[PDB]
Amino acid sequence: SEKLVTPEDVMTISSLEQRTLNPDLFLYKELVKAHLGERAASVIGMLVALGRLSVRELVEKIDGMDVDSVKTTLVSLTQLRCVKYLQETAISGKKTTYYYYNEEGIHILLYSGLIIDEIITQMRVNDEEEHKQLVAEIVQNVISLGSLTVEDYLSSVTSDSMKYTISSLFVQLCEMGYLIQISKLHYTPIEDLWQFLYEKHYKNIPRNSPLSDLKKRSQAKMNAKTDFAKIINKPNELSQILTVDPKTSLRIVKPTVSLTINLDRFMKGRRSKQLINLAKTRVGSVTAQVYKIALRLTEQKSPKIRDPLTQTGLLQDLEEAKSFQDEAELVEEKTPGLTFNAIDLARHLPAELDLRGSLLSRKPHSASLINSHLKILASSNFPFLNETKPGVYYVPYSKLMPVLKSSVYEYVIASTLGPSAMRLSRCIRDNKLVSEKIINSTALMKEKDIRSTLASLIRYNSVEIQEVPRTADRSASRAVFLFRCKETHSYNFMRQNLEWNMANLLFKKEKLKQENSTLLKKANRDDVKGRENELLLPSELNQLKMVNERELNVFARLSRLLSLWEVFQM
Amino acid sequence: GPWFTDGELDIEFINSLLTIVWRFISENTFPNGFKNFENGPKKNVFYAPNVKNYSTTQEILEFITAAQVANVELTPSNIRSLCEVLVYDDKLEKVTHDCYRVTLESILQMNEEFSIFNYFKMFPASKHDKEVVYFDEWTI
Amino acid sequence: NYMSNLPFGLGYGDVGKNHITEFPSIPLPINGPITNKERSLAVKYINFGKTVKDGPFYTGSMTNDGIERYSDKYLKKRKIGISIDDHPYNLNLFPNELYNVMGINKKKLLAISKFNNADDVFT
């Protein structure tokens, strides 16, 4: 410190006012205030802070809003799929609508340009002259307006060829499952839906049963479970291109229903991308292309990132937890669409895989070569691929996502605290529980650096310190201390840390754009946009380029933070 | 053991031992030793998944004893401990008891879409920027 | 006496200085420069933000005089803003009490469309 800083300097320069807010609240509020206005931000803030709220409670809590402003804000939030609702009736018959917050709309606001980029990449249309611009604009219009009907969007264009291309491109986008029909299912909470289904299937059982209460509960639960599995996957399978041949023997998306962005398929794509990035580390570069093709062939039929049955509050029963794990292993192994052989992957390799001298067994997209690639995938340390039968392969999402979590966390902690952090973390993750001397014997490096690095790891919850007393009353003065690794605490802590960093970035960006509103407003409107040179002064050019450069860096770092934060949701 | 010098564990001699054993495992597991991984990753060729390409602890014993760079005769238990140190630091990988192969992340650590896995490449930002991200910011 | 039991690894000089740094000094591996694809991604983010902020769902932030002059003649506001009720609405998705502010009777008209192949950065 060249000169000591007063607490005024700490408050002004260093972000300390921002360290006292929850990462979830701070992230959601900054995102909503960045995209929508301040009223939506305040409504979402009180919704997250106090939980479930009704319209009267929202009027009472938030200061400065009447009922009309609150209802306008709620309509704006509800169009963008940002607030869920449930209509609840009491004993007196007074029906009231409670409002919640749902993750999906906020994540859409946080995944916008990435969704556009991924759908551009997954378009895969050869020789596009105007189609790319059209897909980009239809995706942007869908995300911005929350949900739209195809007929209402078609009326904005009058020419025939572009309307035909609208029809073809919407059919293409719905075919793989990126734009799905919306309904009241996406606006009711999963917990409330499961509670209603369970209660209806429990009250429906005939009374005066001479059969046991616990197994009656489990029977109603199983019927509610199978109906839950039927209802959640209903829009996922097919609900918008079911119509065939309206006129002239063509397939068109239904001109009666509104489409909405399907976020969970985009999560499937991002998990596939993370697996590709992991596979680019142990084995291969062309082999990475092979594993990428293998994932992209099976990206649509992939299981959920989080099982909706897991959020239903049914984890207290250990038997149901084991049943969920076994059902996951059931579906991931013998789904009728996730099993493939060499020949199925033969017809998808582009004209860039050579494979003439790709391998040396000694110490033209053929079946033997692709089989050898799939085998060297099958022999890797992490379970990238598994064989239910020699020749057919399935990717074990149930036994690879923890592995990807561990690898990403270890590389992050190594890049931010040094290779000593990797060494200690792996040493205390391999061994289940160690003292200090076992570390000093097994991990061959100096004593004081072990103590320093391990002390620094406690601050971010990489290791948990376990006390063992040697006295009648417990004390650390004469006790022996063991060191463990609890994966759950660490993963949660770094997830919230990355959420906080993302929200800090967006808050700084919002402050930068708010403080320099004059120049941005002067350059914003269309008659100068693109020809800023003639009217602006020399200093204004530097100021505008500085603002834009900082904005681009902020959003690029936000994308790079998402690339590490998506892994810890799984 | 032989790691201690004057009653304290050293790091230079241990690092030399780890370097030579990792070089040997690189020579045996990936083809041509390090000679294929030179230049870009485009031209590298890997062995078929039906070969006995790993080296066991006895192979390390033989190679280091022939080299005589460790100045005291060493035990297979020391070899197992050293390979455990390497597999801790993500230098090699174990599939079977006393069976190790060199990985590929370590090779890239010597000498495009963002991946956390290759953190050695991309540089820290130029100073005097107010939108710099610190992992240490939230806790303290 | 109190300050007389120092542990094995410290001397009398290290203690007596309680300045824990409030500023951070540990960066992440995400901090680097911007590439071309990342530039296109940032352009997509900023274009989406600028589109939505002027869109039909914004909400407020919570001369300009009423005197009768004659500069108002043949002079008109440079744009007509879009309200909450000027968009197609699916009647089934929205709840029941929210039907007041939104316009069921009023005609559903607006469906915008915009995308640019040219970067909106002045650098």
From Swiss-Prot, chain A:
It is found in: Cytoplasm; Nucleus. GO terms for biological process: termination of RNA polymerase III transcription; transcription by RNA polymerase III; transcription initiation at RNA polymerase III promoter; tRNA transcription by RNA polymerase III. GO terms for cellular component: cytoplasm; nucleoplasm; nucleus; RNA polymerase III complex. It holds the Pfam family HTH_9. Coiled coil: none annotated. GO terms for molecular function: single-stranded DNA binding. Keywords: Cytoplasm, DNA-directed RNA polymerase, Nucleus, Phosphoprotein, Transcription, Zinc. The modification Phosphothreonine is found at residue 6. Component of the RNA polymerase III (Pol III) complex consisting of 17 subunits. Present with 2520 molecules/cell in log phase SD medium. Belongs to the eukaryotic RPC3/POLR3C RNA polymerase subunit family. This is DNA-directed RNA polymerase III subunit RPC3. It comes from Saccharomyces cerevisiae (strain ATCC 204508 / S288c).
UniProtKB/Swiss-Prot annotation, chain B:
Belongs to the eukaryotic RPC34/RPC39 RNA polymerase subunit family. Coiled coil: none annotated. Disulfide bonds: none annotated. This is DNA-directed RNA polymerase III subunit RPC6. It comes from Saccharomyces cerevisiae (strain ATCC 204508 / S288c) (Baker's yeast). Component of the RNA polymerase III (Pol III) complex consisting of 17 subunits. Interacts with BRF1/TDS4. It is found in: Nucleus. The gene is RPC34. DNA-dependent RNA polymerase catalyzes the transcription of DNA into RNA using the four ribonucleoside triphosphates as substrates. Specific peripheric component of RNA polymerase III which synthesizes small RNAs, such as 5S rRNA and tRNAs. Involved in recruitment of Pol III to the preinitiation complex. Involved in the configuration of an initiation-competent form of RNA polymerase.
Swiss-Prot record, chain C:
It is found in: Nucleus. The acidic domain is essential for its function. Component of the RNA polymerase III (Pol III) complex consisting of 17 subunits. Belongs to the eukaryotic RPC7 RNA polymerase subunit family. DNA-dependent RNA polymerase catalyzes the transcription of DNA into RNA using the four ribonucleoside triphosphates as substrates. Specific peripheric component of RNA polymerase III which synthesizes small RNAs, such as 5S rRNA and tRNAs. C31 is involved in the formation of the initiation complex. This is DNA-directed RNA polymerase III subunit RPC7. The gene is RPC31. The chain holds residues 14 to 161 of 251 of the full protein.
